[PDB]
Amino acid sequence: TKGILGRKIGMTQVFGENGELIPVTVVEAKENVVLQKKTVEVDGYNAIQVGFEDKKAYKKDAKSNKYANKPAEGHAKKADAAPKRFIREFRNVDVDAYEVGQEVSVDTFVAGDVIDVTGVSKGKGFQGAIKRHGQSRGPMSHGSHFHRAPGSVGMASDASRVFKGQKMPGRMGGNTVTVQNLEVVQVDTENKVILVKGNVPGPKKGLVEIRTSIKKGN
């Protein structure tokens, strides 16, 4: 059991040894570090607190997240670590391992292993019904005027209210996502790069998050 962070950078091609073309995701686990170790003794759950991008030291008169407010620095000086931009946890891990304040290098992973992922989805604005939900559009000609709009909401003069679960134009994008049952292809420790079969919810340079699958079959 294990899990790391990373960054979607791009997708490519890569071949199996039977000649089967195999698509692939690229991800970068650069500068992963463990920061804090949240026991069940105090909090009520056993987990691992983590950090990914090196950022810089304390402000002087300074400004946004490129640099670091003191409390972050007060958290990263703690375990002999440089301050980090993205912090995330990982429950369901062998907390007996992972001393506070080390690295979670890609070598924990291995070719052939199965995984899930997590990440934000993509930017998408006020999208209509049929693009948000996939409803079916209406007729063009034969004189109509109902091309794309969401249809008749509800029932009648009775059942006056409109039920909550309906389907309407709102934003389509920002959502936590998970994609069970992907596989790993390769682990290049040189560039500290990993490769994941299939494709992941992310934009370029976005956040991506990984862990060992749960539905192995058990």
Residues near another protein, by CB under 8 A:
9-10, 12-15, 19-21, 26, 28, 186, 188, 190-191, 193, 195
Between 78 and 80, name the residue whose CB sits nearer to RNA. Answer: 78
> Cβ contacts of residue 188 below 8 Å, gap of 6+?
194, 195
- Tell me the closest approach of the beta carbon of residue 29 to RNA, in angstroms: 16
Gap between the Cα atoms of 26 and 200, Å rounded: 10
Interaction residues for RNA, span 33-62 (CB under 7 A): 36, 38, 42-45, 49, 58-62
Q: CB of residue 149 vs another protein: minimum separation in angstroms?
A: 18
User: What part of residues 68-107 is at the interface with RNA (CB under 7 A)?
Assistant: 69-72, 74-75, 78, 85, 87-89, 91
Q: Considering the complex, state which of residue 80 and residue 138 has its C-beta at the smaller distance from RNA.
A: 138
Does the CA dihedral 145-150-156-162 come out positive or negative?
A: negative
Q: Could you tell which of another protein, RNA, none binds residue 155, using a CB distance below 5 to 8 A set by kind?
A: RNA
Nearer to another protein, 8 or 211 (CB): 8
- Binding site partner of 189, from RNA, another protein, none, Cβ cut-off 5-8 A by kind: none
Q: For RNA, which stretch binds (CB under 7 A), given 98-106, 147-155, 186-194? A: 147-155
Pick between residue 1 and residue 189 the one whose CB is nearest to another protein.
189
* Interacting residue with RNA among 173, 186, 188, 189 (CB under 7 A): 173
Contact between 116 and 213 (Cβ < 8 Å): yes
Task: Identify any residues that bridge with 11 across adjacent strands, giving them in sequence order.
Answer: 25
Residue with Cβ nearer another protein (26 or 207): 26
Whole-angstrom distance, CA of residue 78 vs CA of residue 73: 8
Closest to RNA by CB, 69 vs 186, is 69
| 141 touches RNA (CB under 7 A) | no
Read off the DSSP letter of residue 43.
T
* Angle, CA of 96, 100 and 104, to the nearest 5°: 80
CA distance 5 to 88: 8
Q: Which of 10, 6, 5, 4 is nearest to 26 (CA)?
A: 10
